[PDB]
């Protein structure tokens, strides 16, 4: 049960890396809305970054959050360097998708999917 680390030795170094990655995304979001001329507000992009950070908040493994910080760094590199287009940035905002049914009753109405 002794594993080789990636960058962090425990959870606190990993939270340091998560914190600096969130800082870098929070600084980047106004430039991302500007140079991609997105139709979203800066607050809405920051709420999406907050949602994407809080989606993975349940992880209690240092190596998994190490790889999550590395993949967030790669996404931030593809955002700062203009490698993504407007479509790749706006794929976080699932706009053209239909609202999915949430309760039991509408999922019962539309099909068989639990």
């Amino acid at each position: 049960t002794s594993v080789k680390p990636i960058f962090s030795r425990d959870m606190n170094e990993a939270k340091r890396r998560v914190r600096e990655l969130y800082r870098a995304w929070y600084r980047e979001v106004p430039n991302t809305v500007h140079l991609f001329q997105l139709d979203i507000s800066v607050k809405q992009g920051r709420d999406k970054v907050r949602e994407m950070f809080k989606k993975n908040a349940h992880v209690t493994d240092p190596r998994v959050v190490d790889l999550l910080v590395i993949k967030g760094k790669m996404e931030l590199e593809e955002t700062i360097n203009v490698w993504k287009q407007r479509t790749h940035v706006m794929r976080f905002f699932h706009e053209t998708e239909a609202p999915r049914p949430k309760d039991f009753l509408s999922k019962f109405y539309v099909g068989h999917d639990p």
């Binding site: 990636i6 590199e77 790749h88 794929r91 976080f92």
Partner: peptide, 19 residues
């Protein structure tokens, strides 16, 4: 595959789409 490689100079995706 998702295999991380440590001390790589430029490790990122090369073949799949960006997002």
């Amino acid at each position: 595959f998702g295999v991380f490689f440590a001390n790589h100079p430029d490790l990122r995706r090369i073949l799949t789409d960006y997002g």
